[PDB]
Design a protein around this nucleic acid. Sequence first.
RNA 1: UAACGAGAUUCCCACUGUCCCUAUCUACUAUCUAGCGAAACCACAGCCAAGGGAACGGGCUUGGCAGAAUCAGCGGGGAAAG
RNA 2: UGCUGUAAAGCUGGGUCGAACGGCCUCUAGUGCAGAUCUUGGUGGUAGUAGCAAAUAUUCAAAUGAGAACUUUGAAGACUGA
RNA 3: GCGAGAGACCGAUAGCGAACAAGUACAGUGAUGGAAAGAUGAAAAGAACUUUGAAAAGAGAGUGAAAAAGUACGUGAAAUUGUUGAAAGGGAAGGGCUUGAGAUCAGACUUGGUACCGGGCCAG
Lengths: 63, 386, 108, 172
Amino acid sequence: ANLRTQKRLAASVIGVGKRKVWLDPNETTEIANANSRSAIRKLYKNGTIVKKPETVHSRSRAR
Amino acid sequence: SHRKYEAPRHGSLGFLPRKRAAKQRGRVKSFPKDVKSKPVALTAFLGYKAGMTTIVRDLDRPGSKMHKREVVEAATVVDTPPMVVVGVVGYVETPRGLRSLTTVWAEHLSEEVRRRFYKNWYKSKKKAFTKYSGKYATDAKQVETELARIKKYASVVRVLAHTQIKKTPLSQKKAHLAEIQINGGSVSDKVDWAKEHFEKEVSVDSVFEQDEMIDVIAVTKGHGFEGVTHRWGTKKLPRKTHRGLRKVACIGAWHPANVNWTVARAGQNGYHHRTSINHKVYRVGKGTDEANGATEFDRTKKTINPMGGFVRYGNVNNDFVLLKGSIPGVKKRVVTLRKSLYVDTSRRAVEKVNLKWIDTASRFGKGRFQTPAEKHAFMGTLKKDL
Amino acid sequence: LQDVVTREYTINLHKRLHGVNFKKRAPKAVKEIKKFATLHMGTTDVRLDPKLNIAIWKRGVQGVENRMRLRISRKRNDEEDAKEKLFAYVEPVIVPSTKGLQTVVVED
Amino acid sequence: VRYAATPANPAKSASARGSYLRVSFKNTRETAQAINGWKLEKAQKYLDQVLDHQRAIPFRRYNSSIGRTGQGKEFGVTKARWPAKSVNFVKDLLRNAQANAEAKGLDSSKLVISHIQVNHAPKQRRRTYRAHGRINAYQSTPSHIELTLTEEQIRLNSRQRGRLASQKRLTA
RNA sequence: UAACGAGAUUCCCACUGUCCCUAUCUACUAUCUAGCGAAACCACAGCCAAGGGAACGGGCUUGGCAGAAUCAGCGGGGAAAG
RNA sequence: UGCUGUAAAGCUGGGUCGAACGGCCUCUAGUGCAGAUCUUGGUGGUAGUAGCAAAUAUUCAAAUGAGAACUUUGAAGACUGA
RNA sequence: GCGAGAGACCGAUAGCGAACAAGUACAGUGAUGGAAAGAUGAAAAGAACUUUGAAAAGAGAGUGAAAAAGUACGUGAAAUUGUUGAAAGGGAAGGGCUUGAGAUCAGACUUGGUACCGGGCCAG
Ligand SMILES: CN[C@@H]1[C@@H](O)[C@@H](O[C@@H]2[C@@H](O)[C@H](O[C@H]3O[C@H]([C@@H](C)O)[C@@H](O)[C@H](O)[C@H]3N)[C@@H](N)C[C@H]2N)OC[C@]1(C)O
């Protein structure tokens, strides 16, 4: 119910900013149990945590 | 020391205090002085301000540069359905002023005037005047004794009358009830005329004729709290004035050590009671006339209402009075029309006006057509017309 | 009285947002829709679907559409000691034009 | 503990207290006076309507330069206000006193608020910073609240005696 | 004395709400509410006119008068505060 | 609650309270407060008043919880703009 | 400095600055500057248990000679404040003098003497 640490750990493990980390809204309890980086990796592999895609910056008008 | 230079006072000391009027309906302070030898008549009439328009006229003032020439003039429309007489009041002279002796009411009161006696009509049992009505049903002898009292003792007789507000487009359902003084004839004649008009309608054309000069009593447009610059027209202080410039810089000398009543101060502006005189009647139109807005020279089959309706009022579907110029009040405001308090013999008072044309283009914008038919003729067929 | 009922409405948000501070237009549209749902369903307990919130904010803080087609349903609220026996659920309606649409009872 | 007022019949009464409550003394005094001497149930209903801004608390002493409202017409005033925190503290104390009365067997619908008062509690100090490097006080003005619920010769001269004897002998 | 100057000054062109003469609009305040909550200052206090008086009184003398509780403003007075 | 004295003051009834204290003859002094912009501490009126307005901006739902404008998660709208 | 005995001395704003974890806490770059603060009760017997409350707490109960001693603790003044009762109130209030009204207080049937004697007070 306070997933601030899990968000920070996922950002570190996945290799993105915190702004690109998606924590499953429907899986709050299991994410709350993920205290180690190892558990964060497991949740990342299962898809419970997801890397959001980058916001497009197209160069088509520039070209 | 004296003022370095002279200037007239800002604002008039005769319209004080600049406070909110006590009632929204404007009251008639004074009625025309009674002349016994005239026919019995009403001296006032209540209507509703509908809006303004433009007319064209030929001027008849010899010696004027515009003599025998067309002039364009602003004019005001007052929606004036007939009033209903519902009662009579007798006043006796006393060394302390006029005192009302008794009030006599008609047998039946319409729902719109009986709504006037209620703050919460929908939650009430509607008992107003229900026991009074039984003073007629038995034999009306008590009513006639009261009227005999008025004949014996009163020196001033006024009728109680109300507007038929449901003939206007107003969403207000309460009628406006007022005392209108009866002038002419003896007191007995006044009481008889009041009695024969109980429950009856009296029309505007019986009080006011065309070319008459009449007075308007109404409460002005409200503006709320106002500063001295606009409330009193004082000079704006220079641009570089610390703490602001819409002020009166000196509000008094050291002595007297009190702010004087004559100094301009910030306060409530507008919503004042005003009695404006000498507004000429340009037309007394009729509600049944389907060419209210037509003249001898402009023969178009046309009502007084502008295309689209009067803005924020509606359509004038009753008898109306077209008055020269502007009158106090806003749209929808109940206005009291009064006969002149004096005899006027000047040209402007005795001129007979003959209207050439009355404008009926939209008041909601830059109206450029007088009629839907003219609009269609100018623009031709449109897509929505197929 | 049909306590449980679903109807579809048009709300004229343009006249309700007239003169409103530009950074409060979308937040005030939220408040206007809540007030609109109480005027028709008689319930102060009004819940807005998050898809409605997305539709309100689609064009930014001052980009609210002039008219929105809403589906409002009054529903029971067991939730004892709630002060409200019913509540109104407000959700958007995808339509090609939000013009010329009358209030319609929805047969679920 | 000693209450400022002791019930006439303690068997038909129930009290409650709150000390050192961090709620405005002035708002609490006005809210306590607004229900002083009322039936308990009437007072609870009224406080709930105050919280909903349907009725207001009349401010009669601590009211200088507060606003004016039409909800004061009920009480003959123009200055009234809706202090939620004071209302909540007073409601909690009324609830506690009702619980105490129920434990003593008293009937809730008969209970009237026969005593209620607010006293100053010691102030809590904070600090506020002023222009030109000055420090001023920023204190709280807390409250002591307490309340109680309660179930609802002519001897005569010689001449006077002689006069009455004579008058009695006259009328039989 | 060319050049230079946030230096002082006069006139001209352009320009304009500086002005004639003001009006209207926006945001934030003020305003009302929930919560929070200071300070300056304070003999006692607080309606006027005249008198006399430390020769310009809130109080004293003689008059005018005088009706609870108040809110937003205001800058005459408190020979206001610092 | 009263009594005595012109007075400075003295005595007494009732309540509160818990460990020492007074009359008389004398001795002695760091011995009597309204003021000193007195000292230290405490407390008011002011006053629920001034005010809590720079730095574009927040919204819906769920979770948690006695309690959520302010916590967490999701959706979104924004900004810093290397 | 070390060891003793005393006083017509002071009695917690006094007496050393300090009666207490006082040259402490804290301030200042530094030299230096430098407070406030003693007392439940004989004994913690420091309130078990029930109940309302999210809780702090309340209400019962309990201990105690006392809770009018509850670690906000000996007594517990004043300013200031709440409630209750009584009264007054047209641009201050307060004071003297006088009386009325309402409240309080007091006294001679005496330390009365033996139905009588005799006295006290207010009056004609
Ligand atoms: C727990 N708070 C402590 C508290 O112990 C406080 O003690 C006072 C204490 O000194 C008082 O006691 C006092 O007793 C007398 C007399 C005036 O009562 C004083 O002369 C004496 O200095 C003092 N002991 C006592 N009556 C109340 C406690 N709060 O001392 C300071 C403090 C921080 O407030």
